[PDB]
Design a binder for this molecule. Structure first.
Ligand SMILES: [Mg+2]
Ligand code: NA
Length: 318
DNA sequence: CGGCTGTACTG
DNA sequence: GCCG
């Protein structure tokens, strides 16, 4: 199924970029369902059947089948392509894009010349094209290795794992996500600092976007002709959290959200730090009592404790 | 009626 | 947008 989704994707993005996040979530989930459906969809009654598809989406499917068109798609605001242009700048989202629009900016030349950018947005605009591009998974390999090689030059016992789409076995990667830990659980942050320093000194790191104590995002470029600037995310964790970190950083993101949402129905909470149980939540679903951390030395343990069958990373790409 | 994941960083 |  891609006949009807292609038309939905355009509404999903229109909604997302105008900041209607939940309606856009509705569309996103429906789109997902339709894609993992075996056969093409035939009846409005078959429509409702599919979890993630209700009356409103059913009617729209019907129109796509009956008319081969979507009336809502010709009513999309003329501002949408511009809002998408703007929020493809790293560091600029829905609010900033809509503000810029209101203020009369219609193009990246307008932003470049007339807009006051944060440090992150200026780096984002500089790399606008490169950030929209995916790298072959083989290039990800060279980057993980460059990072790993450099880390292991401080403390050779450090473990570096490439995560995200790479670990899920995808042929291309939007960025490289490197997870760093140490088996003693005591080795952190003296490294993470100096590590970035050498990588920056080797000329490998071109720009910094986020520098936190355990988390880094920046821009690197491998040496040589024909190389593009790439996004590189690095996080350091204590060995205690290694498995929950690995699970999180590997994703996919829709998978993390599904997992976490299930954990919530079981009175549990899952995050990059821990899976914990006996979590106390107020009526709005917000966490109040922290509950207690459940032991989780491997990804297997996390699935198990949730009552789920183990998925290897490739089966996580939702 | 109202949640839809949970966390971190920046200014 | 969908659903419990
Ligand atoms: Mg990634
Ligand atoms: Na952005």
């Amino acid at each position: 199924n891609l006949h009807i989704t292609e038309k939905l994707e355009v509404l999903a993005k229109a909604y997302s970029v105008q900041g209607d996040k939940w309606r856009a979530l509705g569309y996103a989930k429906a789109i997902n369902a339709l894609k993992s459906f075996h056969k093409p969809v035939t009846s409005y009654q078959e429509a409702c059947s599919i979890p993630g598809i209700g009356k409103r989406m059913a009617e729209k499917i019907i129109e796509i089948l009956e008319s081969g068109h979507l009336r809502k798609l010709d009513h999309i605001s003329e501002s949408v392509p511009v809002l998408e242009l703007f929020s493809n700048i790293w560091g600029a989202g829905t609010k900033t894009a809509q503000m810029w629009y209101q203020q009369g900016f219609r193009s990246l030349e307008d932003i470049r010349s007339q807009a006051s950018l944060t440090t992150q947005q200026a780096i984002g605009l500089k790399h606008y094209s490169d950030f929209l591009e995916r790298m072959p998974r083989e290039e990800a390999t060279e980057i993980e290795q460059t990072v790993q090689k450099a880390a292991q030059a401080f403390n050779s016992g450090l473990l570096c794992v490439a995560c995200g789409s790479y670990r899920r076995g995808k042929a291309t990667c939007g960025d490289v996500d490197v997870l760093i830990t140490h088996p003693d659980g005591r080795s952190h942050r003296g490294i993470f600092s100096r590590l970035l320093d050498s990588l920056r000194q080797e000329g490998f790191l071109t720009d910094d976007l986020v520098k936190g104590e355990t988390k880094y995002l920046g821009v690197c470029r491998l040496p040589g002709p024909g190389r593009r600037h790439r996004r590189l995310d690095i996080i350091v964790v204590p060995y205690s959290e290694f498995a929950c970190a690995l699970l999180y950083f590997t994703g996919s993101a829709h998978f993390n959200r599904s997992m976490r949402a299930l954990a919530k129905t079981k009175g549990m909470s899952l995050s990059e730090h821990a899976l914990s149980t006996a979590v106390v939540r107020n009526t709005h679903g917000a966490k109040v009592g922290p509950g207690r951390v459940l032991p989780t030395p491997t990804e297997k343990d996390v699935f198990r404790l949730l009552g789920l069958p183990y998925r290897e990373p490739a089966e996580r790409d939702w």
